[PDB]
Structure 1
Amino acid sequence: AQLQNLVLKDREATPNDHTFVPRDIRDNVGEVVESTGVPIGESRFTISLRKTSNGRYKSTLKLVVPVVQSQTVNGIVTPVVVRTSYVTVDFDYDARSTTKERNNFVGMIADALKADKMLVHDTIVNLQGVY
């Protein structure tokens, strides 16, 4: 788990590769960043792990992806952030857990984000509730 590049595919027609390049490590918190030429609409992805005192392990993923549009004022073109989207995955394993257990766990909740899993998709994508 050496801070390194992280590539994430999106759900575009023909999936694009978003390449997040490491930036730094503060307080045992890695940060990788997909940056376009201008470092303002840069999307950041952080990751961290810490072992609790009560014998547990807690991982924390954060992904931030802002949207930029060019705002024109008195002829002055300036790229700005019009809105941002945030997500935060939080794991909590028991210090006594086995690798397989953890793997399967991830795998499952991962498979839940899938686009065909209607129950969740119709919520985290199309903003519907449950009924």
Structure 2
Amino acid sequence: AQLQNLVLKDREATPNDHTFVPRDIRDNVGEVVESTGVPIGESRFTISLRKTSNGRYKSTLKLVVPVVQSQTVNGIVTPVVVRTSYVTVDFDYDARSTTKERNNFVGMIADALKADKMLVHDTIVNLQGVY
């Protein structure tokens, strides 16, 4: 897994391609950025993999996408983050797990995010409780 581009699609009317491009690796944590050239508007996606002491294999994804409005006056722009959204995924695997297993695992949780998975969607997207 060499640091490279990563292109995520959103759920827009006609899917848009957000293209994060390598920014760097700092302490075994890769960062990829979808940017304009201005650090705060940057939506960043990071990823890491560590083997704990007890021998479990953990890895973490983090995606941060800020919403920023740029006020413009006589030519000078003044960006300001008006709100942000963050999400973190953490896989905890067993040193005896097989690739197939792991894969299916991801597959499942990945699938659980789909828009039609009512139970989930209404919460992660519509912010409704469970009851």
Indicate whether the TM-score tops 0.5: yes
TM-score for both structures, normalised by structure 2: 0.94
- Measured in 2, the distance between the counterparts of 1:124 and 1:29 equals 26
Could you tell me how far 1:74 is from its partner in structure 2?
10
Mean alpha-carbon deviation: is it higher for 73-82 or for 60-69?
Answer: 73-82
Structure 1 pair 73/88, CA: closer, same or farther in 2 (3 Å)? same
- Measured in 1, the distance between the counterparts of 2:76 and 2:2 equals 42
SS at match of 2:2: coil
Could you tell me how far 1:36 is from its partner in structure 2?
1.9
Mean alpha-carbon deviation: is it higher for 75-84 or for 6-15?
Answer: 75-84
Identity %: 100
- Measured in 2, the distance between the counterparts of 1:85 and 1:7 equals 18
The answer to whether 1:55 aligns with 2:51 is: no
User: Over aligned residue pairs, what C-alpha RMSD do you find?
Assistant: 1.6
SS at match of 2:36: coil
Could you tell me how far 1:85 is from its partner in structure 2?
0.2
Structure 1 residues 48-81: Cα deviation after superposition (integer angstroms, max 9, x where no partner): 0000111110010000000011246899641110
- Measured in 2, the distance between the counterparts of 1:72 and 1:28 equals 39
Structure 1 residues 101-123: Cα deviation after superposition (integer angstroms, max 9, x where no partner): 00000000000000000000000
Query: Structure 2: any 5+ residue segments left out of the alignment?
Result: none
Q: How many corresponding residue pairs?
A: 131
Could you tell me how far 1:37 is from its partner in structure 2?
3.9
Mean alpha-carbon deviation: is it higher for 9-18 or for 73-82?
Answer: 73-82
Could you tell me how far 1:38 is from its partner in structure 2?
3.0
Could you tell me how far 1:10 is from its partner in structure 2?
0.1
- Measured in 2, the distance between the counterparts of 1:115 and 1:75 equals 41
SS at match of 2:121: helix
